């Protein structure tokens, strides 16, 4: 009962969750699998972690697919030793990393009205900010009114 963790790097565009699972499950049995992705935009950092049930199987997989040329990409498949496998490494394993249109969200947010009494205490805050802008603008020498 010694699970083995392999790190794959230099991932070609498209060799994602499902292709990785199929390929390395055709090699063996995967406990968990996760490509790392960006929260702001649903794009991968071109690297992934696969925890196999069998450390030996993971070792042969790493040896056979370490220096592979796939779509102009030399892969990097290396077993990480069980000493530095961080306990909270497979946190988003096996789930779905969804793409969140944060820009549209902020935009719908800018269009949703509200009682702007709080936005008027906020315009008191922006009057103090343009006072800050004016005090940094005194070295410039530009005077502007409200």
């Amino acid at each position: 009962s010694q699970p083995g963790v392999m790190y794959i790097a230099r991932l070609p565009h498209g060799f994602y969750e499902h292709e990785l699972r199929g390929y390395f499950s055709q090699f063996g049995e995967i406990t968990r699998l996760r490509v790392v992705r960006n929260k702001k935009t649903g794009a991968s950092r071109h690297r992934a972690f696969i925890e196999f049930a069998d450390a030996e199987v993971a070792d042969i997989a790493a040896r056979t697919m370490d220096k592979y040329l796939l779509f102009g990409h030399i892969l990097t498949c290396k077993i990480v030793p069980p000493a530095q496998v961080h306990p909270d490494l497979f946190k988003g394993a096996n789930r779905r990393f969804k793409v969140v249109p944060w820009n549209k969200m902020a935009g719908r947010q800018l269009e949703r009205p509200l009682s702007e009494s709080q936005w008027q205490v906020k315009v008191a805050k922006e009057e103090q900010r343009r006072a800050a802008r004016a005090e940094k603008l005194k070295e410039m020498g530009y005077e502007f009114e409200a």
Binding site: G14, H18, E19, G22, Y23, Q26, L70, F71
Partner: protein
């Protein structure tokens, strides 16, 4: 045994298929065809292995399930939509009278009780059709050429044409006619 090479290949193929399907959905009616009531012959040819769900449904509806199979379809606007959706897997064009004669007389069949009986007798022709005034196989040819009121049930009678592989031979217009001499 399957390779990561393949896995990535089909991944990008389905990615492009999704992109193109959204584009039509956004630009519903992209195919700039003038409004003419004509006939289109469509042949399913080998393409991408994993067909997306809506193209699979359209192919099942058009009965182009197996490879290298041709059917006749009335050119309506929904027809154009589905044909240009399923464009990657099919070759489509405008038939000719000699061509339809050859297909119906050499490779013509009919669907009876879910069984394929070769078009061997006008008696079977009045047995299946005829209630709408289709008396003979060349009456069927006539309606197919000059599409009439009963094209839907006519095509339902015609079981899709199983062609032969091309022996040394989008919208192909009259060139699909050369294709179907090459495949027939």
């Amino acid at each position: 045994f399957k390779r990561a090479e393949k896995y990535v290949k089909e991944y990008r193929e389905q990615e492009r298929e999704k992109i193109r399907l959204a584009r039509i959905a956004k630009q519903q009616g992209s195919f700039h065809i003038p409004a003419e009531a004509k006939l289109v012959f469509v042949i399913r040819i080998k393409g991408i292995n994993k067909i997306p769900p809506k193209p699979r449904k359209i192919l099942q509806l058009l009965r182009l399930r197996q490879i290298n199979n041709g059917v006749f379809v009335k050119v309506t606007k929904a027809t154009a939509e589905m044909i240009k959706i399923v464009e990657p897997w099919v070759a489509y064009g405008y038939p000719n009278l000699k061509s339809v004669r050859e297909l119906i007389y050499k490779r013509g069949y009919g669907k009876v009780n879910g069984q394929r009986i070769p078009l061997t007798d006008n008696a079977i022709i009045e047995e299946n059709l005829g209630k709408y005034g289709i008396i003979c196989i060349e009456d069927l040819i006539h309606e197919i050429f000059t599409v009439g009121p009963n094209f839907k049930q006519a095509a339902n009678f015609l079981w899709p044409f199983k062609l032969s592989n091309p022996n040394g031979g989008g919208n192909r217009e009259e060139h699909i006619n050369a294709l179907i001499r090459a495949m027939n």
